[PDB]
Amino acid sequence: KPNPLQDANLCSRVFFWWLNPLFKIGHKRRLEEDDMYSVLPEDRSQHLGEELQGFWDKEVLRAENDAQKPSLTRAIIKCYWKSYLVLGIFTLIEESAKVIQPIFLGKIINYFENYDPMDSVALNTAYAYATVLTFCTLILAILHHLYFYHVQCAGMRLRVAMCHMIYRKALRLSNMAMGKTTTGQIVNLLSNDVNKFDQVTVFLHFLWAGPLQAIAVTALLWMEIGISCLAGMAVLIILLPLQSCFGKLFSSLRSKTATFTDARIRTMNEVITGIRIIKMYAWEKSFSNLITNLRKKEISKILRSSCLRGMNLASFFSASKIIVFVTFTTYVLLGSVITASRVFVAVTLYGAVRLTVTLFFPSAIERVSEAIVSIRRIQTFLLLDEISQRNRQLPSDGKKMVHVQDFTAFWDKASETPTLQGLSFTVRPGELLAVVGPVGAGKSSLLSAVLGELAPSHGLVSVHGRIAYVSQQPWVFSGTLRSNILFGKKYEKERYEKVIKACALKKDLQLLEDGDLTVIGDRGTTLSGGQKARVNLARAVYQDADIYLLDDPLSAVDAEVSRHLFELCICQILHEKITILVTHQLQYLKAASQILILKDGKMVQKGTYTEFLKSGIDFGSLLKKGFQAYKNYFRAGAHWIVFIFLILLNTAAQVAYVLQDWWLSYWANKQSMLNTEKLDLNWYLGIYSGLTVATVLFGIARSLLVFYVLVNSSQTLHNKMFESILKAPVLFFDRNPIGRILNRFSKDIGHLDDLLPLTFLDFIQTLLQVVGVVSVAVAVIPWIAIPLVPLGIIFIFLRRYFLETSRDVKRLESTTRSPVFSHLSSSLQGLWTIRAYKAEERCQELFDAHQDLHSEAWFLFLTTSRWFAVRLDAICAMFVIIVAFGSLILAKTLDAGQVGLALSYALTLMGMFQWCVRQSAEVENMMISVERVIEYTDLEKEAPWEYQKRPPPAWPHEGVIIFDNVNFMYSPGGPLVLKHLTALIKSQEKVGIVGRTGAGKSSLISALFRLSEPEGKIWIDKILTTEIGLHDLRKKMSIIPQEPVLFTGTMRKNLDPFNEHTDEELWNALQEVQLKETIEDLPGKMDTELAESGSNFSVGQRQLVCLARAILRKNQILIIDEATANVDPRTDELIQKKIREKFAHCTVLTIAHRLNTIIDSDKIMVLDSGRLKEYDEPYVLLQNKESLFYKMVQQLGKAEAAALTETAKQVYFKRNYP
Ligand SMILES: CC(=O)Oc1ccccc1C(=O)O
């Protein structure tokens, strides 16, 4: 894919003309991967990583020569000082523009001060300064973007080289170094830790330019305004520790918030995961209270953090006002007059140095601090202990064989028990060696030593021949599946086919929809254990090496294909190869001509299968061991009258912001139109400070009120969201995954709470300063409006033209990054499989590809943004040229102050308009969080919780149930699960239920609880389910789910989350379940805060807690849905005892797979495809032995079946005829 940057001239490189052909492709349609350009030859992953590795190897060699800790920063700085110093050269010619440009504004406004129509030479020099002003604005606005691309490109090159190294080392890490760390500690080295090199370079030249820019700003400020500058510079300095104090206090508040926020999100994951449970038990009032209090405590901290961010972002807005008010509060109280040229040179210089000192210098320090942290962490990673490179193959004498002698080594040196103990064996060509030994003998470290992956501690190994390693764990990575099959080797179609069809993969390749060349899903998500096992086996067959170390490869396959390959392929093709094979399976011990047996690193015996059998020693014994969004968003927070007040406060903040500068302008005008006469200093500076304090107060009020209204929008949208998802029918959770909904509560509501209010107030603030600039120009030179409406339209269309591609680039920048981390993650898993093959050469190349492709995406991300920024800055430069020249062609009308105000604002337009547009896009893609949230507030609610027509307070009293033609179905328009269901349940009746789960067992329960309103008619004690409030039905019903769910918090919550009862009944219930000792032996007997879902509890204990809950409820109807499905037999029968003793007076519905559960049945509901076909007493149903009940009973065995039938008859006669 040719890269127009490769062969584009300087003009079409500074203007990114070379990138237009891409926009004309994105405007029409969506950009896919194949449409991205290719990365320059000097940006490939290899070239960069190899240069940096050469420098870093040189530096570690030099340091070890000096015997001092080797520095990685030195390797970097040596590798990237040539490029990143010429970058600094343009940094100088750019910040010197930023600093000199004001000194040209000064000489424009100075011609305006002494304007004389006749002196056309002064006019021409004013045009000269305007032209050089445009020159500065253009080397700042047009040429800044090639420079900024190149700075971000230095950062990209550093990141890519560092990723290449990190990957190479990760490949060469030794188990001693690897097992210490975790694959995550590495993948985060690439994900979040090397991504610190994309940004360090961005401002890494403000380390010496922020200081140097500030010194030159201060020096010019001296030469203009005497000491007066020091006051503004003092406030500007304070913004450094002041912004740092904001940062520290807001980080404290953010972490204190995060505690509450993650408590809320954990409670949310629990309520969503077990939402079915909560609805059934009718507790969502409790969890509603719990999360209402959690969110009130979190919103207190969010509102405090937002108030502080409001006072911060109002201090960035008012910053220049306080900085130029302390500056001319000092400059006028010292006998010096105010002049528009000096004022607006000073305001422009303060804008420059304020951006520099509070946003570019603090950013530079922060990011180089994180970059040094990252460099040191990668340093430690790259100094970790490596494997000893394959003991250099002595040019073989044709001897394909391996001998290990008395090898003893450790997982870790500290262990007194070595992995192996003086083990010696030699394998020569053609020998079929089956390795046998109990688990834990050191299989991993065993073959690691055989591979040479385990450094010697005792013994010695001679290795001559190629090796293919299959680990017990199969391994398959992210990439072309043919990359796995060839494992990076050259393609042989015929032998490829033989390898593929040898494992009978025709079946598996039919299991693949995309055939045998499928691009494997991310990190192998498309394969199971057996599938990856077969992939590994095929890879092994492919290489045809001289050695075959297999660690129980057949554990994932059945005997059929394993025997096929073993006798036809392994014992015929691979037996000629030196096979060292582990095997748990007896079926292939038959085929081991040579067997070698070990026990816990001890040499049991070596010999043939025949000898091992003849010795009398058993194998088993040795082995066995859009615009509705914005409207509905601003409405959810405040009453539209408060939005009118918000608009008025925004406008007044901005009007006072612009009017302090207009007051300096009027001040210059009324000092010029004078003289001896002094200005009314008290009056003029009083109004000046009035406007300044009005601007600061309105900035703070605007920020605080915008944050308050939008955080209140988040709080009200969250309340509606949660009150709608508690009342959202179970269907809305079946159609959606637990993770999708909870994402809307963590990520989306974090945007609405934390970032979207801030991003949106920053957008409004920068937009209103943009409009202040535009309107000052349009109000001093009204004719400017005529150029605007082209620019506006152009801008608008440009912004339409751009955002089409730069949303398909920002999507390619992100959809191609994940492979970079995925290849690392996968290679880390099968690093032993890799290094068994000399393959650090090729897998390095696949990672080089992945990194190159993501660097193509990042190259387009870097360059489309610079294209758009070049054109936005050309818009702003046209603005500056028409306010700079358009003013001088109008100098008869305008006086000094007017031009000062207008142009000083135009110069600020530069960059501030770009931030306006960035923030507009940020809002417009963060308002998808708002749209994706308001999607939930408006959501179909299930029946009301409380109707006005209520049953008697203690209803039901008899526990009678009436089913009449009740049909149920997961969702309207879907398949039915209950079919013409009709049945009576008398008071205190015991009715078992048999059927398939979801074929009518659970659906009938859901209909009973009205999870989804069913067809037909359900009465209880002459009262219908559907016409009564959902709680008034569910609360008075008690149920035990298939899986009993515990909720984090106190045992009292799990027992009585309303605290409507006393501790006496709680302990009665806990004694009934005989967990009384289990809890009283805990520090918090009634306040025992359990682990996550009681993760320190057994399934039986959680089931017993649910039993205690049901006992406490004392409802007249009990429901059990396969509660006896995942319980131990002993506590199972104990629970049966408790249920049959306590709930005797209540009607009981039992849904069980164990038939002991139903011997007490008064009736049994047999469901065939959801139809209640047999409805009688159990033994009566057994009398018709053609009954399905009889079939299922016999399916457990005729002995137990006959015993159960006799017991059923006995209980039948015992009840009916005592
Ligand atoms: C006013 C302005 O936009 O200054 C900036 C320039 C570049 C990036 C960010 C900012 C900012 O406002 O924080």
UniProtKB/Swiss-Prot annotation:
The chain crosses the membrane at residues 85-105, 128-148, 199-219, 220-240, 320-340, 343-363, 432-452, 639-659, 691-711, 756-776, 778-798, 874-894, 897-917, 958-978. Residues 84-369, 643-925 form the ABC transmembrane type-1 domain. ATP 1 binds at G437, P438, V439, G440, A441, G442, K443, S444. It is found in: Basolateral cell membrane; Apical cell membrane. Glycans are attached at N675. One of its GO terms (molecular function) is xenobiotic transmembrane transporter activity. Residues 402-625, 961-1194 form the ABC transporter domain. N-glycosylated; leading to substrate-selective effects on its transport activity. Its cofactor is Mg(2+). Pfam families: ABC_membrane, ABC_tran. Keywords: ATP-binding, Cell membrane, Glycoprotein, Lipid transport, Membrane, Nucleotide-binding, Phosphoprotein, Repeat, Translocase, Transmembrane, Transmembrane helix, Transport. Interacts (via PDZ-binding motif) with SNX27 (via PDZ domain); this interaction accelerates MRP4 internalization. Belongs to the ABC transporter superfamily. ABCC family. Conjugate transporter (TC 3.A.1.208) subfamily. This is ATP-binding cassette sub-family C member 4. The gene is ABCC4.
